[PDB]
Amino acid sequence: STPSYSLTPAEASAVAELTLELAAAYGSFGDPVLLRDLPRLAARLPEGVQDFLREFKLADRHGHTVIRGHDFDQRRIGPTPDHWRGRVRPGPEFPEELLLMLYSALLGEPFGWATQQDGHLVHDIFPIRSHENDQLGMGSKQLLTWHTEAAFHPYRSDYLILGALRNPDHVPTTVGELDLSSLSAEDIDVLFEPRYHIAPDESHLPKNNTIATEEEAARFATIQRMIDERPLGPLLYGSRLDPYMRLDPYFTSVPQDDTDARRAYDALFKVVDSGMREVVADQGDVLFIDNHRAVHGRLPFQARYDGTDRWLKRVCVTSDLRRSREMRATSATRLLG
Amino acid sequence: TPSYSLTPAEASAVAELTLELAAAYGSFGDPVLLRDLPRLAARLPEGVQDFLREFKLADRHGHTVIRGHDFDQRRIGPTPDHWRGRVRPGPEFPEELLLMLYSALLGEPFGWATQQDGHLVHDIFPIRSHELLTWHTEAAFHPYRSDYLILGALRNPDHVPTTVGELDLSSLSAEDIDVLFEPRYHIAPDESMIDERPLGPLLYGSRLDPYMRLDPYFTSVPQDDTDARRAYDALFKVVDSGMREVVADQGDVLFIDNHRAVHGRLPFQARYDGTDRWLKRVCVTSDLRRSREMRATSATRLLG
Ligand SMILES: [Fe+3]
Ligand SMILES: [Fe+3]
């Protein structure tokens, strides 16, 4: 099936030790020196773990992989919080967040969305009672149906890194890839063509934010133009033999009169749906998603709200930070918005 | 403009590393070397990694230089007559490896399948057979052009310059810039499947501090677009008049940001006796996957 790496207890221990040393040496993520040193620091990780991610990145074949067996010290980490707002930064789980930042530097550059949890590079995935009814990360009861992250956005993540601090009930993440053998050459061709409209989530709508001041007008200008012009785009791209995809069923409009587009899209939708895997990121697992080769989602679960709930950390990764310069306030900031 | 001058200790640490690596891997066709490159770059002196990383993340300067490497002139040998025919890797392999390590610090080495048999490390030396004063963005037309160029000067006995120039913005007005940000210019290919099409901009990214792709010789503006030709003229004047002479001396490695700086070379009398100027050159991509459609396999780093 899809490769994973299981850490020996020695490797788990060397990672944990690195991670505590760095938490203590660096103050927060607000320290620009940390961001600068990341790739050099990620080269102190066990070499087998660095070779493995590098092969995964370079092979550009599997849509996800997992590194299992980290030691995430429960007593040190503490209770799953009630909310992301108002916590002291960094929390006692700072070593785990640093972990994920080191991994993100092996794969490219960590970045974040200005609208998402105040733009924390490593963000939180846990149940907030007040968000109980919503379809998202901090949700619970609602099925989070599968999708490419920010499918419509030309600067969407290349990879996503999910780190499970706890998952007492073993609640799986859904991830699914494209079995191309299942699609007709006719359907593929159609899917490669600019025929499909992919709509922004509300979170990316520009009229969300500060209407005036030239800066912020120029910065949303590309997304505005996209809303105003509704250009059609492909669902499949890269190589015909092994294509990338971006599929967000909920926000995709197949134009009514394009009979060929509809036929191929249903083909594509059905293949990806029936290929969907449940992947359990247990405590001490880190899940890597290739945003160009897999969709992901999450199953509903009952939350307790007592500090014992599932708690994942998440980092968005770009292979090319400069590409998005137009959507960033400064050269230095890693936040779009 | 920021540069880093190696101590002799640093210089020796680098030479030693590149010699150890050269004995350890056969050639660049070794997929394991290619895999290992970021991890191996992390064995270079720390101050050098931090310096390069500050340059990449600052995204402020058009070029930078790391000075005072120890390029062993006896080992490296005389400057050859041609690249073609020549066996690879040669005795200058240590220095090519260095450039590959630098390139892994900035992104990923790639090349073009139709330049020099698609050797990831290109040669720059006088050839009799193929025997300027222009400046350009590398592959300005191409959407998968280099993000950075790395130029290592194995030797440059007559101190012949490279030309590099950036955009001084304050000499352009906000009308001209706004025009240049729009998709109203054609940029032609070269002797270099997915093909010719739309009209691109010249300036992009932030409007307060723009990137550029600017190849004067192969740029055209539709006659009818007179706002465009006016603000084009005003961009060229700014750029051409800002050009600097940068000498990549023996032991210098020049890093050019392909989005913030154009470069060219200056004509020079060659002598063809094995003692001429020899640079090496590696093209760097921030996002190798972005070019997948023009590469024959997942694994190859050659475009086309
Ligand atoms: Fe998601
Ligand atoms: Fe050139």
What ligand is nearest to the CA atom of residue B264? 2
CATH architecture designation of domain A1-337: 4-Layer Sandwich (3.60)
Provide long-range contacts, Cβ within 8 A and 24+ apart, for B30-34. B31/B299, B33/B100, B34/A58, B34/B301
Tokens of A250: 């909920």
d(CA B20, CA B15): 9
Tokens of A100: 């994920």
Q: Give the C-alpha distances (Å, rounded to integers) separating B222 from A2, B188, B198.
A: 52, 13, 13
What does the radius of gyration of chain B's CA atoms come to, in whole angstroms? 20
d(CA B196, CA A240): 20
Which of B261, B256, B245 has the alpha carbon at shortest distance from B284? B256
Residue B298 to residue A61, Cβ atoms within 8 A: yes
b/e burial code for range A170-200 (CB count within 10 A of at least 16 → b): ebbbbbbbbebeebeeebbebbbbebbbbbb
d(CA A187, CA A129): 44
* DSSP string for A159-215: EEEEEEEE-TT-PPEEEEE--GGGS-HHHHHHHTSS-BEEPPPGGG-GGGS---SHH
Residues of chain B neighbouring A242 (CB-CB closer than 8 A): 298
Angle, in degrees to the nearest 10, between helices B93-106 and B31-41: 70
Residue B121 near residue B280 (C-beta atoms within 8 A): yes
With a CB cutoff of 8 Å and minimum separation 6, the contacts of A189 are none
Q: Could you tell me the sign of the dihedral formed by the alpha carbons of B14, B20, B24, B26, in that order?
A: positive
Residue A248 near residue A147 (C-beta atoms within 8 A): yes
d(CA A187, CA A260): 8
Residues of chain A neighbouring B287 (CB-CB closer than 8 A): 158, 319-320, 323
Q: How far is the CA of B191 from the centre of ligand 2 (A)?
A: 14
In one letter, which amino acid is B52? L
The alpha carbon of residue B179 and the mean position of all alpha carbons in its chain are separated, in whole angstroms, by 28
Nearest CA in chain A to B144: A323
d(CA B189, CA B187): 7
Which of B205, B246, B291 has the alpha carbon at shortest distance from A237? B291
Only one residue has tokens 């969305």, namely A113
Residue A157 near residue A294 (C-beta atoms within 8 A): no
CB pairs under 8 A between A and B: 86
Q: Could you tell me the sign of the dihedral formed by the alpha carbons of B108, B114, B119, B122, in that order?
A: negative
Angle at B193 between CA B187 and CA B195, to 5 degrees: 20
* DSSP string for B162-184: EEEE---GGGS-HHHHHHHTSS-
Angle, in degrees to the nearest 10, between helices A94-107 and A32-42: 70
Q: CB atoms < 10 A from the CB of A212, how many?
A: 7
**Edge-to-edge strand list for the sheet holding B162-165:** B244-246, B162-165, B262-265
Which of A204, A247, A250 has the alpha carbon at shortest distance from A224? A204
Give the 3-state secondary structure percentages of chain A, helix then strand then coil, rounded to 5: 35, 20, 45
Residue A331 to residue B298, Cβ atoms within 8 A: no
Residue B42 to residue A39, Cβ atoms within 8 A: yes
Which of B45, B44, B46, B25 has the alpha carbon at shortest distance from B36? B25
b/e burial code for range B21-35 (CB count within 10 A of at least 16 → b): bbeebeebeeeebbb
Nearest CA in chain B to A329: B206
- Interface check for B224 against chain A (CB to CB < 8 A): the answer is no
Angle, in degrees to the nearest 10, between helices A9-25 and A47-59: 90
Only one residue has tokens 């691109």, namely B200
Residue B284 near residue B186 (C-beta atoms within 8 A): no
Which of B16, B279, B302, B266 has the alpha carbon at shortest distance from B132? B266
Residues of chain A neighbouring B288 (CB-CB closer than 8 A): 319
Which helix or strand (DSSP H or E) is residue B239 part of?
helix B226-242
Residue B38 to residue A59, Cβ atoms within 8 A: no
Resolution of the model in angstroms: 2.2
What ligand is nearest to the CA atom of residue B115? 2
Cis peptide before A90 (omega within 30 of 0): yes
| 3 state DSSP class of A316 | strand
Residue A72 near residue A92 (C-beta atoms within 8 A): no
CA atoms within 13 A on the CB side of B144: 21
Q: Which fold has domain B1-304?
A: Double-stranded beta-helix (3.60.130)
d(CA A317, CA A116): 14
Which of B198, B258, B278, B215 has the alpha carbon at shortest distance from B56? B258
Residue A331 to residue B259, Cβ atoms within 8 A: no
Tokens of B207: 């409007």
d(CA A200, CA A147): 13
The DSSP output letter for A279 is E
Q: How far is the CA of B192 from the centre of ligand 2 (A)?
A: 13
With a CB cutoff of 8 Å and minimum separation 6, the contacts of A337 are A113, A114, A115, A119, A209, A219, A327
Burial environment of residue A302 by CB neighbours within 10 A (0 to 12, 13 to 18, 19 or more): exposed
Which of A228, A231, A229, A223 has the alpha carbon at shortest distance from A205? A223
β partners of residue B282: B150
- Interface check for A218 against chain B (CB to CB < 8 A): the answer is yes
- Interface check for A36 against chain B (CB to CB < 8 A): the answer is yes
Residues of chain B neighbouring A47 (CB-CB closer than 8 A): 39
Tokens of A319: 């292979």
Cis peptide before B31 (omega within 30 of 0): no
With a CB cutoff of 8 Å and minimum separation 6, the contacts of B32 are B25
Q: Give the C-alpha distances (Å, rounded to integers) separating A207 from A200, A203, A337.
A: 12, 10, 12
Residue A332 to residue B57, Cβ atoms within 8 A: yes
β partners of residue A238: A243
Ramachandran assignment for A200, one of left (phi > 0), alpha (psi -120 to 50 degrees), beta (any other): beta
